Design a protein around this ligand. Structure first.
Ligand SMILES: Cn1cccc1-c1cc(F)c2c(c1)C(C)(C)C(=O)N2
Ligand SMILES: Cn1cccc1-c1cc(F)c2c(c1)C(C)(C)C(=O)N2
Lengths: 546, 546
């Protein structure tokens, strides 16, 4: 029975293959067929290319050796290479053109999801070209999805030498009959077959996957669209900044490029952005996913006033100061969404661009007390229930698993009434003791939230709702302003509290506002519709945040 | 007696002042004298500019109000503004041209060093212009050096209103006669004087500093060249990455731009780069200063083999993988310098550029055992003393303060023999019990190293020297290679072990090698000659690492 799947890189996980460009170049330059492929393999195991693949020499050292082989081959074939003939130019273009073979990667991802050990085994080189970063990026993206990456230039062995296959088997800790090995080079398949491994000769991806599906008995073709890559908390870089003596802020950090600061809502975590973190970093951004004040590994002081918007915003500015960041793009959800609009209003110099999921920008009404305003809309009753210190803490802390399982549900799964929370005595009075697991979350994801909330509970988080008067007074100072920096408002069709219609007057305050809208999306936007969130954010970041 | 110094921003800490550009524009466009300055102040406390300075409106909202005032003023003066007249263009240029008044900042820095509380008090605006980052950067650089920053647009008050001066005094927790206040606007000085503060009307910086020196009795002009900005450990962003189950790497992080990974030597810390961290981040780089494996907050497993170059380099590659970085520039010192050359040789795709301080690149000699090679040069005897597990640990751990005070000394202060360390029975056998403090370090800096080494001691650090055979075998695999990526070798004139002459054959292996050389510099390069190190690294980074 199979338990391991091994994939080649060139022509398998990445397309188009380089040997294809050797042929394509021959045809474009009208050179004899096979001339470049012949000069590339010249000397066989004793040749320049084998030395390169074994890591004896670098790619830049190899380039003139290939040029000499090309001259030798042309002399014998009684032809002339063109005037502007350049091996460097040919390989730069080929490497740059090679992209991840997305259906092959998805199949590798599905096999690993079903318990397979996966590896990439590749004949590759030590790339020291000025343009080497393109390939470093491709390898980085690919390698994260596999248990092992075995590179010929690191191990000093190449396919089709028998020892590299023995090295592979030892690395996998598997017998040959337990392995499926995919390669586009027939000669590189022979030793794996001779050892007793299941082998697939990859020409077109579709046929290769049909063979792979047949042999593993796992559906790989025609599958439902997969979710984006998520985060394993123990594999992330964890950052910590002291913003003031008693307050430290925790964040998770991934990628390079313009800083993108993600601000979660209530009662959440940096982990609420798990589906966005890998995608935004892959899109070319340095992601900083916060544990907002009162949450996770960030400090949670007990005082109400520590959670007013003015204090929270000041602390986020200090956070940027201590990291040496003059700006960040601020993306918020729920309470995080409210905070980011206020960052844009009070600290526009520090905000590269601003985006909110669900939370609209609504200016303070200077002619009405904030308590009066909240009372006017019945959907906001939960916010009145959250007022009295200790009441909501007791209900939410009673059974953490029940709390998160009852809260984190899709629009067509909610056990929460929301109407008359105070009158009914709580949010969960008509909710089961042992809620079913929502289709959005796994038990493991629920337990992460349970583990995080064991540290500080719900006091700090609830305090975000306990500064209505304080926030109203501060917000009133901004009434003559407009938000004129790049801005995006993302509405969720099925958020029954933060309804899309509530955002309708935003253009009055944010004339250049851009929008996104997610159909069949509830309150927990990032985990409800991660693919759609990623598409909207990446498109907006690339056009408006640079 | 004075204990607080307050500085204005425009025309005091930053030059040239904006009001100067209003005058300069008038002259360039041959407009009536004072026309633009008059339209700028139009309406006094009731005008557009006061509203802007109080934070009622943003800079982008203010621009058309200023345009209207300019039209009104021109109509009255019976003149016409030019065809291409633009307030936005005038202010963008002015803000962009304004730079930090370096001698004023140095004086503020000296006063704070001598126990003064320092603050910036400024009439400023909420900047939402597309080009706002330039100013966000300037404010960031400036604010870090002061106890307080009071901005008119945040507090809703402006100079010369009396309340802002009362707010300042309350913020400083000081009586008026205890404050010296510097401003380039005479009208903005009057309320501070009326309260009883010492005031200085800033025209030219030199005269302002003479007045400031006279009143405080502290030398501010003609001072010796100050050291670069250092790091306060509790004010840094601290990062943590698990590279494998039992190994976590700690780093300090500052700035934005291309990733620059700093790798210290033996027996050091991320803190050895304290003078480089702020300077490189200010130069436009994202600095990652490591605690190398075995040190500080990084893991320190006991096994010798955990510290061989192959393992250390693999872990640094995983470190990049987990942070989502395809490359970093690697800068090393001592053992860190050896590691970075090997990163360049084995992982060139992951190394944007490579630099070493003191440590030359010397290829393995395949015809001689590494132990034989070390024996040939008497200056390397300390490395033989470090071989036997437990011997050097006992001496180095006996008295941490004595260890660091004896080690960290300039070339003309060393109590260390280095000749016949084994024979004499130790490095400190002819060293005092209570060494004097070297001119390079403070007692506080020594205690930081003492505190760090209390966690794991010297086993992990010494193990870096205990892999001669293992490193020699691995290094031999790279003998056919050349380092062809951007590289810098920095020699230190007075390093008596890693002598400049030892680097003389490097061009044979690194043909495109760039060099730096520091006169009167010992082994502890970063703290010995921080200004010179900063100059060399920044110049090389900007030309070769992008
Ligand atoms: C955040 N929160 C805490 C307790 C209850 C909520 C909460 C807040 C909302 F905006 C919202 C909801 C719950 C549902 C799912 C009903 C919805 O459709 N919108
Ligand atoms: C790093 N180290 C640990 C114990 C002793 C040293 C050590 C290493 C050196 F390369 C070196 C020195 C000490 C001095 C200061 C003599 C010098 O000029 N060069």
């Amino acid at each position: 029975t199979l338990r391991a799947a091994v994939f080649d890189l060139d022509g398998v996980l990445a397309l188009p293959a380089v040997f294809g460009v050797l042929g394509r170049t021959e045809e474009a330059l009208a050179l004899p067929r096979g001339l470049l492929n012949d000069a590339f393999q010249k000397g066989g195991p004793e040749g320049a290319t084998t030395r390169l693949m074994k890591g004896e020499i670098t790619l830049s050292q190899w380039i003139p050796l290939m040029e000499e082989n090309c001259r030798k081959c042309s002399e014998t074939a009684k032809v002339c290479l063109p005037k502007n003939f350049s091996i460097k130019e040919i390989f730069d273009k080929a490497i740059s053109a090679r992209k991840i073979n997305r259906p092959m990667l998805q199949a590798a991802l599905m096999l690993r999801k079903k318990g397979f050990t996966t590896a990439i085994l590749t004949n590759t080189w030590l790339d020291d070209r000025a343009e080497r970063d393109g390939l470093a990026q491709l390898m980085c993206e690919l390698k994260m999805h596999f248990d092992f990456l075995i590179e010929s230039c690191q191990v000093g062995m190449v396919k089709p030498e028998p020892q590299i296959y023995k090295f592979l088997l030892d690395t996998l800790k598997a017998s040959p009959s337990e392995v499926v090995f995919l390669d586009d080079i027939g000669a590189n398949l022979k030793p794996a077959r001779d050892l007793g491994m299941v082998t697939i000769l990859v020409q077109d991806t579709d046929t290769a996957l049909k063979e792979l599906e047949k042999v593993t008995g796992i559906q790989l073709l025609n599958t439902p669209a997969p979710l984006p890559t998520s985060c394993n908390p123990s594999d992330m870089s964890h950052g910590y900044v002291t913003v003031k003596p008693r307050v430290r802020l925790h964040f998770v950090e991934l990628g390079s490029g313009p800083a993108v600061c993600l601000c979660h809502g209530f009662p959440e975590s940096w982990y609420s952005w798990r589906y966005q973190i890998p995608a935004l970093a892959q899109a070319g951004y340095r992601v900083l996913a916060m544990d907002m004040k009162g949450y996770g590994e960030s400090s949670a002081p007990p005082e109400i006033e520590e959670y007013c918007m003015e204090v929270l915003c000041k602390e986020m500015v200090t956070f940027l100061d201590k990291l040496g960041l003059s700006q960040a793009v601020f993306i918020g959800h729920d309470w995080g969404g409210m905070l980011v609009w206020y960052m844009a209003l009070f600290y526009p110099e520090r905000v590269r661009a601003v985006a909110s999921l669900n939370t609209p920008f609504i200016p303070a009404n200077p002619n009405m007390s904030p308590l009066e305003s909240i009372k006017a809309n019945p959907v906001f009753d939960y916010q009145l229930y959250f007022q009295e210190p200790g009441v909501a803490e007791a209900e939410l802390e009673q059974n953490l698993s029940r709390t998160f399982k009852s809260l984190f549900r899709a629009s067509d799964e909610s056990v929460l009434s929301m109407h008359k929370v105070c009158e009914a005595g709580g949010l969960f009075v008509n909710s089961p003791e042992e809620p079913s697991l929502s289709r959005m979350v796994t038990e493991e994801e629920i337990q992460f939230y349970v583990q995080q909330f064991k540290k500080s509970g719900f006091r700090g988080p609830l305090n975000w709702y306990r500064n209505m008067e304080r926030n109203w007074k501060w917000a009133c100072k901004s009434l003559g302003r407009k938000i004129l920096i790049p801005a995006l408002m993302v509405t969720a069709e099925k958020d029954f509290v933060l309804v899309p219609q509530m955002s309708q007057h935003m253009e009055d305050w944010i004339p250049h506002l851009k929008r996104g809208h997610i159909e069949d999306c509830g309150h927990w936007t990032q985990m409800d519709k991660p693919t759609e969130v990623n598409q909207i954010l990446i498109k907006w970041l690339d056009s408006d945040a640079r």
